């Protein structure tokens, strides 16, 4: 069957990723960003009580999915890529955004694009990969013939710190946040090559979820009426770096 979310409390998993979900320390934590604004649009229209729960530090995206599958959250909202391995254990809403990935490196590194990685120009152990992300999936399929020979990374912060310190030469990142971070935070990091792994982001729900239709109709309505476009402009259309 099916029902509406009105009056229901949803434990909503979120995961730190600027400017999707921005975590500020205050003297407690305040969450802002595209995700929190999206949650408000949905709450206002649908009438659920939002119980927003930030994932622990260093939680990977597959870890968030596994946590929801284990019953730790009711839904999860974020820059979460829809993948076949994830779809085996959870459902996803209609997509909230297209997505693709780019190659991230320190300025001055001599890499022209993905061919350099596939042709063995970079030592595999100097390609940094955040485990439990779709980038890892792409790496294992396309680069290393299934071997985990990358330099493993536990978070975006470790990725940035490692590139800046010359511990790794390159990594992969979703295009939205990659543009955001290189245009606003790390002016000495840059993106190179064509984008790859065209994909989508979706809200994670339980499989065969009672509330699947209600959520999907609402997301599609936000898409159709331009609310998702507005939110994307609000949070992403900014550049600080010279």
- Residues of the shown chain interacting with Cl ion in the complex, contacts defined by CB under 5 A: 82, 91, 94-95, 173-174, 200, 207, 212-213
**Binding of a copy of itself by 200 (CB under 8 A):** yes
Stretch that binds a copy of itself, among 7-15, 48-56, 168-176, 211-219 (CB under 8 A): 211-219
- Rounded to 10°, the helix 34-46/212-224 angle is 120
Cα separation, 134 vs 81, whole angstroms: 7
Q: How far is the CB of 190 from a copy of itself (least distance, A)?
A: 26
Per-residue binding string, a copy of itself, 54-93, x by CB under 8 A, is ----------------------------xxx--xx--xx-
| Interacting residues with a copy of itself between 114 and 173 (CB under 8 A) | 137, 141
Contact residues for 199 (Cβ-Cβ < 8 A; gap 6+): 81, 82, 83, 98, 99, 100, 134
Q: Is 238 annotated as a binding residue?
A: no
Residue 151: count of CB within 10 angstroms of its CB: 19
Cα separation, 51 vs 174, whole angstroms: 27
CB 109 within 8 Å of CB 127: no
Q: Please report, as ranges, the residues that interact with a copy of itself according to CB under 8 A.
A: 1-2, 82-84, 87-88, 91-92, 94-95, 98, 137, 141, 197-200, 207-208, 212-213, 216-218, 220-221, 223-225, 229
């Amino acid at each position: 069957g099916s029902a509406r979310l009105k009056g229901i409390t949803l434990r909503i998993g979120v995961i730190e990723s600027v400017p999707f979900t921005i975590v500020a320390n205050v003297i407690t934590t305040k969450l802002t960003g595209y995700v929190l604004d999206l949650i408000e649009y949905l709450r206002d229209k649908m009438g659920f009580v939002a119980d927003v729960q930030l994932a622990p530090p260093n939680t990977s995206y597959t870890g968030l999915v596994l946590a929801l599958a284990n019953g730790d959250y009711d839904i999860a909202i974020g820059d979460i890529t829809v993948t076949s391995a994830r779809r085996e254990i959870v459902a996803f809403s209609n997509s909230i955004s297209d997505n693709s990935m780019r190659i991230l490196m320190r300025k001055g590194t001599l890499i022209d694009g993905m061919d350099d990685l596939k042709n063995g120009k970079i030592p595999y152990n100097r390609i940094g990969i955040r485990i439990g992300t779709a980038g890892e999936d792409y790496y294992l399929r396309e680069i290393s013939g299934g071997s985990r020979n990358f330099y493993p990374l536990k978070s975006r912060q470790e990725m940035y710190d490692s590139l800046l310190a010359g511990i790794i030469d390159v990594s992969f990142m979703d295009i939205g946040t990659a543009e955001y971070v290189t245009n606003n935070i790390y002016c000495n990091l840059t993106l190179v090559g064509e984008d790859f792994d065209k994909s989508t982001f979706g809200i994670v729900t339980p499989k065969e979820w009672l509330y699947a239709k209600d959520l999907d109709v609402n997301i599609l309505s936000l898409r159709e009426t331009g609310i998702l476009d507005n939110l994307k402009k609000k949070w992403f259309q900014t550049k600080a770096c010279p």
